[PDB]
């Protein structure tokens, strides 16, 4: 009904609207935001998660990754090679040096063409997956370390911590560092805050067209598909927007600036790249709507110790009527990707 084009929406909450995170996600879903797979939320001007970023040069990036990319004609495979630990001061120097710094350009479309032209050359280092938060401890609004969503049931009931999923990660970017096409682990939501630096650019495919992207990718990389159903979960697959266009896959793009949040929605495929030196913070989260996606997520089996969350506690608490059916393997619920989460009822009444 809402957002029939499934385009990426941008929201400008007041501080009063901003305060309750889970409630605001329910709101943006009542406006159809989830249909795009990706949304931007620009927080109120008064809001700041940290007073200054002057004190982080000594922060250690324990496992920076050099991103080797192979391919041509809009189809690539990215190999992430772990380098030795380095400090943020050491990373920033390399990021801003003549060898790695952002090229000169006029319009964004020019920078994007240079990205897709040059991504296999001069492999960059991405300071990815760093355990930590740059939020100050007093910040109660949209705090990536404590969003208070039902994803908290995992740790609360089982004691299980899954780094980056129910804890925060930092990402130190340089020019041409990339994230491959993926949905989140267990098809969760994600939140991404750009603390400082140059922009991060995103592509998204509506969840309602996700299966179409998978079929396409399977055809483009038939060997990877035969060795693992969920091979996109390896996060090694890059596909240009020209290729998506050429094969009729609906998608949108958006650029995230310093100070801005992005939200990804269950089964919303996304990929992108950093423009230059920057720092993002991110984690996963859930709403009641996610539980069915969690139940039905197609997971990677071919690699050891991949992220798998027991859905039992969620089905018992929030779907008691279906619990026995689901344990018997007879729960044939079909997901409607257009429907907002039940918690949005407040805003739809």
């Amino acid at each position: 009904t809402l957002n029939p084009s499934a385009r990426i929406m941008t929201f400008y909450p007041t501080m009063e609207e901003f305060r309750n995170f889970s409630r605001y996600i329910a709101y943006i879903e009542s406006q159809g935001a989830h249909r795009a797979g990706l949304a931007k939320v620009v927080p109120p001007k008064e809001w700041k998660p940290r007073a200054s970023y002057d004190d982080i040069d000594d922060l250690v990036i324990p496992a920076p990754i050099q991103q080797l990319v192979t391919g041509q004609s809009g189809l690539f495979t990215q190999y992430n090679i772990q380098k030795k630990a380095m400090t943020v001061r050491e990373f920033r120097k390399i990021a801003n040096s003549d060898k790695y710094c952002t090229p000169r350009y006029s319009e964004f479309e020019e920078l994007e063409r240079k990205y897709w032209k040059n991504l296999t050359f001069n492999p960059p280092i991405y300071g990815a997956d760093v355990n930590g938060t740059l939020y100050e401890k007093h910040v109660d609004e949209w705090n990536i370390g404590r969003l208070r969503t039902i994803l908290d049931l995992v740790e609360k009931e089982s004691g299980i911590t899954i780094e980056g999923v129910n804890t925060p990660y930092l990402y130190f970017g340089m020019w041409k560092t990339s994230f491959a096409w993926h949905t989140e682990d267990m098809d969760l939501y994600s939140i991404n805050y750009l603390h400082f630096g140059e922009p991060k650019s995103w592509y998204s495919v509506p969840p309602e067209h996700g299966k179409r992207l998978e079929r396409l990718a399977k055809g483009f990389f038939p060997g990877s598909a035969q060795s693992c159903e969920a091979f996109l979960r390896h996060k090694m697959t890059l596909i240009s927007p020209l290729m998506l266009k050429k094969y009729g896959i609906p998608f949108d793009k958006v650029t995230q600036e310093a100070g801005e949040f992005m939200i990804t929605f269950p089964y919303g495929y996304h990929a992108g790249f950093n423009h230059g030196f920057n720092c993002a913070e991110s984690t996963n989260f859930a709403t009641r709507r996610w539980i069915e996606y969690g139940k039905q997520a197609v997971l990677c089996s071919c690699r050891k110790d991949m992220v798998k969350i027991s859905m039992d506690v969620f089905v018992r608490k929030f779907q008691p009527e279906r619990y026995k059916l689901w344990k018997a393997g007879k729960d044939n619920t079909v997901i409607d990707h257009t429907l907002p989460t039940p918690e949005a009822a407040e805003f739809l009444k």
Binding site: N80, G164, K235
Partner: peptide, 8 residues
């Protein structure tokens, strides 16, 4: 397990 940016 943990979340990862990608593999090789």
């Amino acid at each position: 397990a943990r979340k990862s940016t990608g593999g090789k």
